[PDB]
């Protein structure tokens, strides 16, 4: 069987100065053949720890590796600003080699509720035979957020796609964009298109909606 590497947390929100520990557990004994990496968006990985506890040459000492059996935790004693990135465990105990899925470290800030906007389809797009209905949630924290589309109160599945921004450089908030796709015909069969936004900064789920053919 191939060895499994599964990481926890899958993402972690912390602030500079935090003690951060990322854990990773192999599905069989892998002795100490475990490597850690830091990867920043768009750039290639950088080795932090080898032999599961050997601090790689030139990597700052706030990084350290640690083992208990199949338990591998990479810990950073005191988070610094250039540490916000993705982290990886890897087993090189046997071929085939295996990476963990990755723990992204994001900047913790005060809860910020989304501003919700919705946009009905253009007259231009509807002329093409397609209707795309867009909901924007703007400048929120944390990332976790339910977007639920309703067409005449029917909950939608399998007809929407979401996209999220990277944490903002200046307010460390995110923006998400859910777009509902319908055929033009499917669109004119109904009246009320709605976006339901459920979030921690909101007392209760907020909804933005429109009626097909509204001024």
């Amino acid at each position: 069987s191939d060895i499994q590497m599964t990481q926890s947390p899958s993402s972690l929100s912390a602030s500079v100065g935090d003690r951060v520990t990322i854990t990773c557990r192999a599905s069989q004994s892998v002795s100490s053949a475990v490597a850690w990496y830091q990867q920043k968006p768009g750039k290639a990985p950088k080795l932090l720890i080898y032999s599961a506890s050997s601090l790689y040459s030139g990597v700052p000492s706030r990084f350290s590796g640690s083992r208990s059996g199949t338990d591998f935790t990479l810990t950073i004693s005191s988070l610094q600003p250039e540490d916000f990135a993705t982290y990886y465990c890897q087993q090189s105990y046997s071929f085939p080699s295996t990476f963990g899925q990755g723990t992204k470290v994001e900047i913790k800030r005060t809860v910020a509720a989304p501003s919700v906007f919705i946009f009905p389809p253009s007259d231009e797009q509807l002329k093409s035979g397609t209707a795309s209905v867009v909901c924007l949630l703007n400048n929120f924290y944390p990332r976790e957020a339910k977007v639920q589309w309703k067409v005449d109160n029917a909950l939608q599945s399998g007809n929407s796609q979401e996209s999220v921004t990277e944490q903002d450089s200046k307010d460390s908030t995110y923006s998400l964009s859910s777009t509902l796709t319908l055929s033009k015909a499917d669109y004119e069969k109904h009246k009320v298109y709605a976006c339901e936004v459920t979030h921690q900064g909101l007392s209760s789920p907020v909804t933005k909606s429109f009626n097909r053919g509204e001024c």
Binding site: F95, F99, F119, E124, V134, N138, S175, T179
Partner: protein, 226 residues
């Protein structure tokens, strides 16, 4: 400081097609270390693929590629290779080759990696975007500010460039990551937040540029009123 690895030769290739990545070494003799290929899907994590061993030519594969990919080295050229065959939509990624260090110095840790080459596999032809305004109005106003934007719809391949007022407008914009539609095309939107009172007083134009299809599109976004 002087070790460097330079992948080269990736690109678009149709499903079932073949592509040979290169991995040029410099700063060290490639023969005495183990050389890998790692891939990373768009937005996904790193996925180990392949390796070839010093002095033996022992090669290894991950299950997902076994029997299609052929890792090799050419020590006269100080270069490693990845031959890829019967490529699939799933094989779309940025590919790194990596040097596993010297045993006494870095264990089996990968101490140098290339900057990666982009391998995109699709049956999708090149196609310039449709831009459709996301018109501002009520339902897109939260007090002093309004949200407005453009939908860049049904283009291939990545990337497009989206600027506002030919670059003059930048702060408060978000251009979103492309999302791949089950049609094999990409599609994104870009939104801008502005002070609401400017809706009558400042014009706004999304500038959508998609070099692969050599199309440049300006869409004036105008409010909807009543």
């Amino acid at each position: 400081s002087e070790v460097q690895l330079v992948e080269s030769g990736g690109g678009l290739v149709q499903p079932g097609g073949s592509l040979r990545l290169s991995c040029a070494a410099s700063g060290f003799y490639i023969s005495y270390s183990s050389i890998h290929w790692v891939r990373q899907a768009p937005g996904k994590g790193l996925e180990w693929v392949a390796s070839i061993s010093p002095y033996s030519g022992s090669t290894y594969y991950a299950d997902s590629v076994k029997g299609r990919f052929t890792i090799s080295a050419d020590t006269s050229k100080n270069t490693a290779y990845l031959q890829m065959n019967s490529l699939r939509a799933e094989d779309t990624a940025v590919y790194y080759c990596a040097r596993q260090g010297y045993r006494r110095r870095s264990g089996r840790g990968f101490d140098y990696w290339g900057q990666g080459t982009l391998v995109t596999v699709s049956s999708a032809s090149t196609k310039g975007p449709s831009v459709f305004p996301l018109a501002p109005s009520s339902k897109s106003t939260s007090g002093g500010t309004a949200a407005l934007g453009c939908l860049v719809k049904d283009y291939f391949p990545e990337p497009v460039t989206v600027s506002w007022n030919s670059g003059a407008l930048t702060s408060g914009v978000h251009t979103f990551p492309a999302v791949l539609q089950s049609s094999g095309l990409y599609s994104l939107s870009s939104v801008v937040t502005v002070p609401s009172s400017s809706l009558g007083t400042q014009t706004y134009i999304c500038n959508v540029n998609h070099k692969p299809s050599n199309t440049k599109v300006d869409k004036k976004v105008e409010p909807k009123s009543c």
